Amino acid sequence: PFIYYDWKKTILKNINEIIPKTFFMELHGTKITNSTLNGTWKAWNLTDEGEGSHPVLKCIIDDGYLDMNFGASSEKIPLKNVWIKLCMKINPNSDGTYSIPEKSSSFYIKDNSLKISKDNLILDKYLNKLMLSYFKNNIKNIEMFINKSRIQTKVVGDLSLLGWNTENSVSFRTMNEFIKKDNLYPKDFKAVYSYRKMTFTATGTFDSWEMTTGADGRNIRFKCPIKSAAYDLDGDVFNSSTENFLLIQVDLTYFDSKTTINDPTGENDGKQFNLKVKTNVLIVTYNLTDTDGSMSSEDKDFLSLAFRNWFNDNIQQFEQIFAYILLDETAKIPEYQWLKPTQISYGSASVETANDEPDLDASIFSAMSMVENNTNSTPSHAVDNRMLQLTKTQAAFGISFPLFIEHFLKQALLSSQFISVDDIVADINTLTITNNKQIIFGKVENSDGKNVDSSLKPGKLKLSLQNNLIVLELFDLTWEQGRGVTGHFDFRQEYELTLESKSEKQIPILKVHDEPEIEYYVEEAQWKANEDMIVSAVVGTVFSMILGAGMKLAGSALSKAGKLIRSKATTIKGRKKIYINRSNVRQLRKDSGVTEMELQRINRRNSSIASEDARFISNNGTTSIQTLGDMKKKPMSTGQRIAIGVKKITGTAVMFGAVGLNFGEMLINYINAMENNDYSAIPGINSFMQQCIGAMQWPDLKVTFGKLQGIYLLGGTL
């Protein structure tokens, strides 16, 4: 599971007794004889500037000073009301306390409120350095601060887009390959910091900048490795080692741009946005070391001020575009307008190995979107860190379950022609498409030879997502089975949306998952009066349900199914109930005596009928009430009506499987391909992938993973 950390909620439900009020730190050096930090605390409070397991702590100073003794003279800077922001990693333990590591990449100063020019970076540096040492020394007190902070955490059990409709994702390793090839980062530098006429200079060359781990959400972090460099510390010169780097941290933003990308799936009438570094650079930490290891830590302090200057002046030279997005674009095929972004953001999810080093394959860089002018009024930058771990692919695309049910399931039930568009309702809350009023399911010939309407109350027909499976449910399917008896049936079947290799292409197929489950119930009075008639009627109906056709069976098969029906008959609250579980279905299939050959003919015929009915589906996706009433009044077995509709429901996977190939003919193609096992004209999932990422492009996708798992998640290779 993924732990969501709701820092905004934590803030609105919040300790300082844990911290002694008076702080004091001292550091001896060479050029700086003595640095001294001394003051009193006003208040620590958690902020909502943190993301995931990286809260930000703001610590306001009541009064105090930083004094820097340069030997001859000194500088004493007042700290009244000055704040400092600390960022840390929190690791939950079993009992709901947290550990906090103290390595410099995880436990570091984000910012302070000290007012300084480019000359006085040295003041800023020593305030942060001495304060950070103080925080390390009070690590156990900070752990206690956190333990007592009543941190709000939602456990996210299955994969999530965290409020977003779509998400386009690549691994850090992939993004590092783009950065390197594009070669748009500053290679050479002359980094300078001057203070009191002392000058500190770094001159050399970077290797390719690498996106790395340790931050999350909007905070993007790069290792800038030094290839070689000469470090001139006010006349004293040191040559770098080959392990030297700076770890920096920036935000990105989407800049308006003239259209330069082509969207093959769109009209190219959007506004293009290029995702680039925002303008500046936090240096989180660094490895600066000379070939003789003689450099003091003071030497390294000054030197990092030179790079700080340089990164602040030159970050705009890192000209990488991390994402090209066409916003408010019209799609070429209007049935895929729902995949075109109307709001965007980005984010990342860092993942570490068991030994706490970067996992660049599991770590995710992400562009996210809302579609169809759905607004996200709380745009989180958090990204579920499990996606690429699961897909084991370098890239992926995600669609949220609410979007999936509004665009795929809604249509699939429409394609079934069990229900008209006037009667259909989508419930995002329960991931369910259902009927808003009573409907006729269809005409059936009852046990006394009379044609009667079978019907379903509001809410009783359901096509839904449950445990990552598509579930077709009919509850309380009612009709008069004979002799004035009113019978009631429940039917339930799970389907799985997998990818199958066909002609060496990956094809999205919706297929039965396990046996169905059928229940029947009747007034108890009627069961007593009319038992043997009810059993035979139940046997008939369960047989057509199981087999998908109301065909004549062996006289022996009906008495064999009759013993089983009877043996599951129980009583609840003035009604008799019969539950036919999954092994009961398997046993009933054997007792039917139906051969493999006859089942194929049943399916063939159901498929043909499905294709024939699908001609009455308009480009809209909908079928006319008069056509629906005609199909419905024609008497047929409950089982066969359900099975013909299922062919249309599974066929609606054409939406993922053969984009391009109107809707009615598209449907007929897939229904036909599934019946003949002929997908030579079928492109498969990659056709749908092209619709997803036409308007959301990387700096340059074959799909080999495609399941429901909290989100519809497509994973592949570029």
Phi, psi of 118 (to 5 degrees): -65, -25
The answer to whether residue 414 sits within a structural domain is yes
Query: Is residue 379 classed exposed, middle or buried when 0-12, 13-18 and 19+ CB atoms within 10 A define those classes?
Result: middle
Phi, psi of 117 (to 5 degrees): -85, 180
Q: Could you tell me the residue range of the domain that residue 624 belongs to?
A: 400-684
Other Cβ atoms closer than 10 A to 680: 9
The answer to whether the beta carbons of residues 352 and 323 sit under 8 Å apart is no
Alpha-carbon span 640 to 630, nearest angstrom: 16
Alpha-carbon span 602 to 550, nearest angstrom: 10
Closest CA to 240 of 230, 225, 250: 230
534 half-sphere exposure, CB direction, 13 A CA radius:
25
Other Cβ atoms closer than 10 A to 386: 21
- Residue type at position 265: T
The answer to whether residue 369 sits within a structural domain is yes
The answer to whether residue 448 sits within a structural domain is yes
- Residue type at position 657: G
- Resolution for the entry shown, Å: 2.1
- 444 shares a domain with 346: no
In the chain, the number of structural domains is 3
Alpha-carbon span 645 to 222, nearest angstrom: 54
- 193 shares a domain with 128: no
From 338, 357, 392, give the residue that closes a domain: 392
Alpha-carbon span 7 to 54, nearest angstrom: 10
Which residues have C-beta within 8 Å of that of residue 597, sequence separation ≥ 6? none
Which residues have C-beta within 8 Å of that of residue 265, sequence separation ≥ 6? 331, 332, 333, 336, 690, 691, 694, 695
Alpha-carbon span 452 to 373, nearest angstrom: 46
Which residues have C-beta within 8 Å of that of residue 665, sequence separation ≥ 6? none
From 375, 392, 409, give the residue that closes a domain: 392
Ordered DSSP codes for 564-614: HHHHTEEEETTEEEEEE-HHHHHHHHHHH---HHHHHHHHHHHHHHHHHHH
- 123 shares a domain with 101: yes
From 339, 359, 392, give the residue that closes a domain: 392
Which H helix or E strand runs over 98?
strand 98-99
Distance of CA 163 to the CA centre of its chain: 9
- Residue type at position 179: I
The answer to whether residue 715 sits within a structural domain is no
Closest CA to 706 of 468, 519, 425, 441: 468
- 660 shares a domain with 625: yes
Closest CA to 405 of 158, 652, 673: 652
Closest CA to 18 of 49, 46, 38, 51: 46
Q: List the beta bridge partners of residue 83.
A: 60
Question: Which tokens hold the place of 676?
Answer: 């003949």
Q: 3-class DSSP state for residue 251?
A: coil
Alpha-carbon span 310 to 216, nearest angstrom: 25
Which residues have C-beta within 8 Å of that of residue 40, sequence separation ≥ 6? 21, 22, 23, 61, 62, 63, 64
The answer to whether residue 143 sits within a structural domain is yes
Closest CA to 654 of 254, 336, 184: 336
- 138 shares a domain with 208: no
- 221 shares a domain with 73: no
Closest CA to 296 of 26, 32, 36: 32
The answer to whether the beta carbons of residues 216 and 51 sit under 8 Å apart is yes
Question: Which tokens hold the place of 682?
Answer: 């079928």
The answer to whether the beta carbons of residues 295 and 289 sit under 8 Å apart is yes
- 267 shares a domain with 205: yes
The answer to whether the beta carbons of residues 171 and 203 sit under 8 Å apart is no
The answer to whether the beta carbons of residues 56 and 50 sit under 8 Å apart is yes
Phi, psi of 81 (to 5 degrees): 65, 5
Question: Which tokens hold the place of 133?
Answer: 């040492």
- 132 shares a domain with 221: no
**38: phi > 0 → left, psi -120 to 50 → alpha, else beta; which?**
beta
Alpha-carbon span 238 to 229, nearest angstrom: 9
- Residue type at position 611: S
Strands (E), 421-574: 424-427, 432-435, 439-445, 451-456, 461-466, 469-482, 485-502, 505-523, 569-572
Other Cβ atoms closer than 10 A to 317: 12
Experimentally determined by: X-ray
The answer to whether residue 50 sits within a structural domain is yes
Residue with tokens 């456990």: 155
- 274 shares a domain with 183: yes
Which residues have C-beta within 8 Å of that of residue 28, sequence separation ≥ 6? 34
- 140 shares a domain with 260: no
Alpha-carbon span 716 to 696, nearest angstrom: 15
The answer to whether residue 717 sits within a structural domain is no
- 674 shares a domain with 536: yes
The answer to whether residue 516 sits within a structural domain is yes
What are the distances in angstroms from CA 77 to CA 36, 198, 700?
A: 10, 20, 51
Alpha-carbon span 82 to 65, nearest angstrom: 10
Q: Which residues of 449-466 are buried (b: 16+ CB within 10 A; e: fewer)?
A: eeebebebeebbbbbbbe
- 456 shares a domain with 345: no
Residue with tokens 């290679």: 187
Closest CA to 32 of 1, 75, 63, 94: 75
Other Cβ atoms closer than 10 A to 434: 21
Which residues have C-beta within 8 Å of that of residue 255, sequence separation ≥ 6? 273, 274, 276
